[PDB]
Amino acid sequence: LSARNLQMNGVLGRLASTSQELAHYHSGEEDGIYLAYSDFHAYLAGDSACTKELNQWFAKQLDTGPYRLVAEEGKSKCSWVSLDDTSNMLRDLEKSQHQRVAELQRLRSIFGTSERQWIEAQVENAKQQAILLTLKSQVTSVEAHIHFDLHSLRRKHADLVEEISTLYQKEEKLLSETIPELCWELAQLQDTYILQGDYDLKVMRQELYISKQKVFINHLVNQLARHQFLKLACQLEKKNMLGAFSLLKVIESELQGYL
Amino acid sequence: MTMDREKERELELESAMYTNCLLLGLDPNVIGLGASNGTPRVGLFRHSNPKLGEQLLYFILSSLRGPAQSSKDFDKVWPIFDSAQSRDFRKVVQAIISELESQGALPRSNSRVSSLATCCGPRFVELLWQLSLHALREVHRRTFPADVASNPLPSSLTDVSFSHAATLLPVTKARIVLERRRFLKNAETAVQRQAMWSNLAHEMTAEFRGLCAEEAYLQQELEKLNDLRNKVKQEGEVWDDLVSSSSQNSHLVSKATRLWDSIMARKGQHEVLASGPIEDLIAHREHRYRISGSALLA
Amino acid sequence: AYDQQCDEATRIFAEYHKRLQVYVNQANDAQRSVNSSNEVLSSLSANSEREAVYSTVKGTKSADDVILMETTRERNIRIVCDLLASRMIERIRNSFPAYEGNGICSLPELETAKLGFEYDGEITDEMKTVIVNSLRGPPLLLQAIAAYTLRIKTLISREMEKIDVRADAEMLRYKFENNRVTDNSSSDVSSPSNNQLLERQKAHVQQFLATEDALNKAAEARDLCHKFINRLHGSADTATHSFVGGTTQSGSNLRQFELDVWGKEREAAGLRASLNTLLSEIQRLNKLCAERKEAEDSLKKKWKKIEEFDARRSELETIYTTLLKANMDAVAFWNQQPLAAREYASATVIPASEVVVDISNSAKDFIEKEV
Amino acid sequence: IARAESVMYIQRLTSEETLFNVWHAISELQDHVTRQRIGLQQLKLEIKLNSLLNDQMVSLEDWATLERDHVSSLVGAISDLEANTLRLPATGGTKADTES
Amino acid sequence: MAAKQMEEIQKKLRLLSYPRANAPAQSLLFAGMERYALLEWLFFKLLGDKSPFSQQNLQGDAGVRDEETVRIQYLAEIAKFLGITPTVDIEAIQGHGTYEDRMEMLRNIVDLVEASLFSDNQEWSIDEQVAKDIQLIDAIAERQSLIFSEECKLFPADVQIQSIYPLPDVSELETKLSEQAKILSNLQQKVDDLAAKHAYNPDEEYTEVESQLRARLESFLETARAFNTIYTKEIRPWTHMMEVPQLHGF
Amino acid sequence: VAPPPSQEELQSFASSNGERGDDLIRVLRELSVVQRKIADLQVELQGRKDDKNVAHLTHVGEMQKKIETLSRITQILKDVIQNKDRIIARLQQPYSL
C-alpha cells in the first residue's frame, strides 16, 4: 500500500503556482471584468446607433406621418374658412362632382304633358260603390228607417255624421302657392341626406390604419422594454467578480489552521 | 422780292401824265421865270433842249412824225439849217415861234395862259425854248387842228361842236382828273407812283419775316428746307396721287410697312377684341377658397 | 492529535481555483471552459474572466439562444400582438397622452417593469429567458449580444415596417386619398356600380319607390296638390252612376235625409294618397328641425374628426420622443456606471500580491504529498 | 372822262400778265413759309423716322419676314394672323342659338 | 366803314325825315308849317327857283297845291337829272329803293339840319360842305391809295375771309383769271402763314412712336422678335377651344 | 376813321369799299400766293394720305396693336404653354361643377 505515494507524487506535483496564478493575474481580472464590459462599451458606436434606428423605423414617418397627419389636422378646424385650398385642392375634382350627384338624370323631363295627365295620382281602392248596395235597397233607406219628415231639412242628415264636417281637411298647404319652392328643396325633403357620407367616408379613410394599430406603438415600448431585458447583464458582475476580488482573501484562512 | 412784281403793269399808266404835262404844267413857267438867273440855260439850251431830248421826248410822236413832220417843226428846223450863218440870224426865233402859239397852239395857249403867265412877258426865253421842244411836241398837239380840214371833209364844220372831246389835244391842262381817278380803279400798278400796289410790310413787300426775302431765295436754296421731304416721302406723298405707284410703294416698302398695310391691315380691324381671353385665363381661380369651406359656414 | 489534519490540508490548499470562482458564475463558466480539459489551464482562473473575454465564441453560443430568443421575442409579438396590446391597448391610445413622464429617460427601467411582469403574465414564453443574461454578463451574455444588438434590432425592424406604416396608412388618407378621390366614381366605371360606395342605402330602400314620372317628384309642390286631387277626382265618377241612384228618387225632400243615410256607406277607408304618401318624411319633420341649424357640424364632420386624430397623430409624432429620447434602449451601461462604481474600488488589487503567498503555498502544496 | 374805258382796260390787260407771271412766281412763297415748318416737321421726321421705321424692325425680325412675304403671306401669315382673328366673331354670335 | 351808312341814314328819310329830307320838294306842300318852321334853309339848299324863295312861300305858293306829283320830283332842280327818283318817292316801296342818287344831294338836309352852310345849295355835300372833317374832303378821299389802304397787314387780312368782297378792283381779275380771288378764302383757312406748327404732334407721331416703342417695349410687351411666322405652326392646339362649342353645338 | 364824319359819313360810301379796293390787288397777289396755302396746309391731307396708310398709319394702327396681336396669338398660346403645370392643376376644381 506504500507504493501509492510513489505513483502519485510523480504526476500530481505539476500544477505549481501557474495553476493558481489567479492571484498572479489578479490585476488583470479587476479591469478585465471592465474589459469585457469595455468591449460592450466599445460597441457603443453601434449600441447608440441600433437604439436610434429602431426608434427611427416608426419615426421613418416624420414627413409621411407627423408633418402630414396633423397637417390636415391643421387644415381641419382652423381651415373651415380656408380648407378649399389648404387640403381640398387635391380633392377638388371629386367634391363638386359628387356634390351635384347623378340623380338629376331621372328627375327633370317634359312637364307640360305630365301637368295634364301624369301629375295626377292613381286609385287603388274600390270603396266608392259601397252605397250601391243600400243605394239599390231604397226600402230600408226611405221606407223602413223613416227617420225623416217635412222638418228634417238638416237634423236627420246630421245624425249619422256631424263632427266630421269640421274635421275634414288635413293635407292642405301644398295645394297652391307652394309652386316657387321647386328651386332648392328638391334634394332636401325626400333626398334630404343626399350626400351625408362624403366626409363620413373620410372619417373611415382617416381611420384606415387598424390592420396595424393593434400593434401601432405597443411593439415600440415593448421593443424598448424587451431589448433592455437582453443587454442588462452586468447585474451579477458586481457581486461575484468581487468574490474573486474581495472574497479571494479567504484562501489565506485555509493556511491559518496549518500555521 | 416785290420789284419782280412790277414788270409789265407800268406801261399804260406811268406813260399817261408826264408825256403830256411836261410841256403845259410848269415848263413854260420855269423857262420864263429863268430870265432872272439864266446861267444854266447858256450851257444847256444849245444842245440839251433841242437835241438831247430827241432820244426820249421826240420818239413819242414818231408814229405820226412822218406825214406831218413840218407842221410846227419848221420854226425850229429852218433856223438850224442856217447854223453856219447863225451869228447874223438870231432875231427871227421869237417871230417864227409867235405863230406856234398863234396857229399851232393858239387854243393850247388859252389853256396854257397860267403856264404862260410868268412867261407871257419874257417870251424871248420862252419862245426860244418853244423853238426847241414846245414846237416839237406841238407837232403832235397840232394833229387834231390839222386833220380836221383834211380827213372829215364832209363833216368839217359840223364836227367842231362834236370835237369838244377831240379839242383836248391843244387845251391840255384840265385832263389831269383822268389819271387822277385812274390809279384808284387800277391802283394795281405799284406804290412808288401815286398808286399803291407795292404796299405793306408784313405780307406784301417787307414780308421778310420769312415770306418775301425767302421768296427771292425760294429759287436757289430756301425752297429746299421742306421740298426734300417728298423724295423721302417715297413711302408717302410722292407715291400718293398715283395709286399704282402707291400699290408698288407698298411693294417697294417691303422693309418698313408693307406687312402692316398688306399682311395685317387686312386683320387689324378685328384683332384688338381678344384682350378678353387674357382676363378669362386668370378669372377661374377665385373660387378655390370659399365654396366647400363655406358650404354651411353661414 | 491535531497533526493529522495537517496531512489532509495540503490538498485543499492546492485547489483554490476549484472553489475561488465557482460562486463567480461569470468566471466559473470560463474557468470550467478551460480547466475542464486539463488543470494547466487553471491559470485562466482570474484570467477566466479574461478567458471569458476570450469566450466571445462561448458567449456567442450563449448568445445564440438569445439570438433566437429575441427573434422569437420579436415574432411572439407578431403572431400574437393582442396579448401585447392586452397590456398595451392604452399605448395605442394614451402612451403619449398618459404615459408622458414615464418614458422620458427611465423607459428601459420602468416600462420594462410595468410590461415585463405582466408580459410574462400574458406572453409567458419571453420573460423566462431575459435575466439569464445577467448570470453570464459581459463575459458571455452582455458583450456577445452587444456584437449582435444590430441584428435583433434590425430583424425586429423588418416586422416594424408593417406597423410603422400605420402613419403611412393615414398618409394614404391625408394626401394620397386626397389625391386619390378625383374621378373614381367618374372614370373607373361609367355610371358607377363600384363597391367602394356603401353609404347610399338610405335612398335605395326608399327613393326607388317612385322613379318613373318626373313632375310627381320634380314638382313636389303640385305633386301632393294633384295627388290629393285623386280624392277630389271622384266627383265625375259619382255622377256617372246617377241612373242607379233613382231608387229613392221620389220627391224634392227625399234626398236631404238621404245625404247621410246614403252617406253612411260611401264614407269609408279611402285615404291613402294624401297623408300616407308623405308619411315617411313628415315624421322626420316634427323631431329633426333643429338639426337643420345644427347641420353645420354634419358638414364639419371631416373638419372635426381629424381633431381626435391629432391626439393619435401628435401621439404619432411624440411616440418618437418616447423612443428617440429613450436613447438608452440599447445603451445598457446607462445604469451600469452606478453598477461600475460599486466595483471601481471593490475590484481589489491586494490579492494580486498577498494571496500570491497562498497560491505559492498552494504551489508548494502540490508536492508535499510525497511524505 | 376822255379816256373812259381806257382808264382801266389797258391797265386791266397789263395787270393780267403780271397777275400771271409773278403772282404765281411769288406763289412759291407759301410753299416754304407755311411749309418751312413742315420742313422742320415732315422733312425731319422722314429723315429721322422713315429710315428708322425701317430700322425699328430690327427688333421685329420676323415681322420683317412678312412684308417681303406678301406674295405668300396672304395664305400663310393670314392663316396665322386671321385664325386667331376668327377666334372672336365666331365665339359669341354662334353660341347665341343655345337659348333657342 | 361807310357801307352801313347807306342804310342807317336812309331809313330816316323814308319815314322819319320825309318831312325833313326825303321829299322837301313835296314838303313845299307843307311849306306853311315845314319850310318856315324848319325846312327854310333845307329848301334853300335843295330846290331850284323855290330855293331862294325864303320869305315868299308864305303868300306865293298857291299854285303848288296842284303840283305834289311833279312838285316832289323838283327835289333836285339843281341836279335836274337827279330829280327823277323823287317822282317814285311817292311810292315808299321804290322811292326808298332809289337812293343811290337821290340820297346824294339830300345829304345837306338829313344830317345838315342846318343846311345853310353856304355851299350845299347846289353841290351834294361832297367837296367842302364836308370840310368839318379833313378826311371828308374829296381830294383826300382818293388818298386812300397812299394812307388808308396801308396799315400793317391787318385790314387786308380782315377782308380776305370772304371770297366775294373784291368789288372795286376786280376788273383785271374777271377777264381771264379770277382763281386767285377764289383762293382768297384760303388765307382765312391758313392765317399763321409762318408758324402753322400744329402738325408737330399728329403727323410726327405717325412715325415717331415707332422708334420710341423700339426703345420702350423692351422685348416684354413686344414679344415679336422671331416668332411672328412661328405662330403659324401652332395655332390649332389653342384653337381646339374654338371647336369644342362647335364639336357639340354645330 | 368812321366816327369823325359824324354828319357826312353817309356820303363817304365811295371811301369805304375803295379803302381796300386799292389794297384789293394787294391781297389777291398775296392770295395768288395763298393758292399755295392750299398746298402747305389744305393739301397736307392729300400728302398725309398714303404717307400714313401704307407708310405710317398702319405703321401705327398695325404696330401698337402688337400689344394685342401678341397678347392674343402669344399670351393665350405662349403662357399656357410655359405655365402648363398650374393650368391643368387649376382646372381640377372648376370642371366638376
Side-chain angles (χ1 to χ4, degrees), chain B residues 18-24 56-64 72-73 100 108 130-143 169:
Chain B
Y18 189 81
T19 177
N20 203 334
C21 200
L22 77 165
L23 207 72
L24 287 86
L56 306 176
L57 307 183
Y58 288 2
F59 287 159
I60 315 170
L61 73 164
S62 290
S63 63
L64 58 83
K72 299 289 94 176
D73 205 357
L100 169 77
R108 169 183 175 183
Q130 276 210 347
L131 176 137
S132 285
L133 183 63
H134 184 126
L136 264 290
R137 179 91 269 177
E138 184 47 55
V139 171
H140 181 74
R141 265 192 259 286
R142 205 177 157 251
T143 55
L169 183 62

Side-chain angles (χ1 to χ4, degrees), chain A residues 26-122:
Chain A
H26 196 249
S27 309
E29 193 194 23
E30 303 138 20
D31 62 337
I33 67 171
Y34 283 100
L35 189 153
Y37 167 67
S38 308
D39 310 327
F40 166 65
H41 187 71
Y43 273 120
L44 173 59
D47 278 316
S48 190
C50 60
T51 177
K52 297 287 95 175
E53 53 93 21
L54 68 88
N55 294 332
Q56 280 298 114
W57 305 102
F58 198 78
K60 88 182 173 64
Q61 294 296 131
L62 294 174
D63 197 70
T64 59
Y67 293 99
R68 176 156 159 169
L69 309 196
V70 300
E72 216 170 356
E73 146 68 18
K75 319 170 265 195
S76 54
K77 176 59 211 77
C78 205
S79 294
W80 166 239
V81 75
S82 68
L83 192 39
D84 311 337
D85 189 89
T86 61
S87 176
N88 284 142
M89 151 205 78
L90 307 176
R91 290 174 281 174
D92 266 344
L93 188 153
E94 73 94 19
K95 156 79 196 189
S96 187
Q97 175 261 297
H98 279 66
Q99 194 167 1
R100 60 174 188 256
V101 188
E103 297 291 326
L104 183 63
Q105 191 47 253
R106 53 159 73 74
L107 172 43
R108 295 261 208 183
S109 79
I110 295 304
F111 303 121
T113 66
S114 61
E115 177 261 323
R116 209 59 71 206
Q117 289 90 14
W118 292 270
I119 196 177
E120 185 60 30
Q122 283 74 26

Side-chain angles (χ1 to χ4, degrees), chain A residues 4-23:
Chain A
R4 295 186 300 177
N5 301 271
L6 192 143
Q7 192 182 1
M8 295 298 102
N9 56 3
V11 63
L12 201 64
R14 304 289 182 181
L15 265 74
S17 70
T18 187
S19 60
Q20 281 85 3
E21 65 91 21
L22 59 89

Side-chain angles (χ1 to χ4, degrees), chain E residues 37-96:
Chain E
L38 188 153
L39 286 79
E40 170 44 57
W41 52 91
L42 282 75
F43 287 12
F44 181 76
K45 302 308 206 71
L46 205 80
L47 299 172
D49 71 335
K50 304 281 166 290
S51 178
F53 289 169
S54 284
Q55 305 175 359
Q56 42 270 48
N57 281 118
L58 56 90
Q59 61 182 0
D61 61 343
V64 193
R65 68 188 299 182
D66 207 5
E67 209 200 341
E68 190 265 355
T69 315
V70 67
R71 186 50 178 93
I72 184 170
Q73 67 88 30
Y74 179 82
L75 205 67
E77 170 81 7
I78 307 309
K80 278 311 278 182
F81 177 78
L82 193 153
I84 185 65
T85 61
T87 318
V88 66
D89 187 33
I90 311 281
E91 177 177 2
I93 299 298
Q94 188 52 267
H96 206 188

Side-chain angles (χ1 to χ4, degrees), chain D residues 47-61:
Chain D
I47 299 293
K48 195 201 154 304
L49 278 297
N50 208 347
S51 43
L52 188 40
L53 58 93
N54 295 252
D55 182 46
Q56 180 207 12
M57 294 177 71
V58 178
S59 50
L60 312 162
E61 306 272 29

Side-chain angles (χ1 to χ4, degrees), chain D residues 7 25 29 46 50 64 66 78 81:
Chain D
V7 159
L29 179 152
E46 305 280 329
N50 208 347
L66 293 194
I78 289 315
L81 272 48

Side-chain angles (χ1 to χ4, degrees), chain C residues 209-260:
Chain C
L209 272 299
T211 45
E212 294 179 356
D213 192 19
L215 204 58
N216 285 325
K217 277 74 69 177
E220 48 272 35
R222 305 298 92 186
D223 167 69
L224 182 62
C225 167
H226 295 64
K227 288 298 157 294
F228 182 76
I229 301 299
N230 176 268
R231 298 283 75 77
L232 260 68
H233 206 270
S235 181
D237 297 0
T238 311
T240 317
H241 304 273
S242 298
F243 71 105
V244 190
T247 67
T248 312
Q249 292 297 108
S250 300
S252 61
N253 45 359
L254 275 299
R255 194 91 274 166
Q256 269 82 7
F257 79 96
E258 292 279 353
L259 294 174
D260 69 337

Side-chain angles (χ1 to χ4, degrees), chain F residues 31-42:
Chain F
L31 270 64
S32 63
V33 185
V34 167
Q35 301 177 249
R36 209 66 172 155
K37 271 196 175 89
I38 321 173
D40 49 49
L41 181 81
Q42 181 168 352

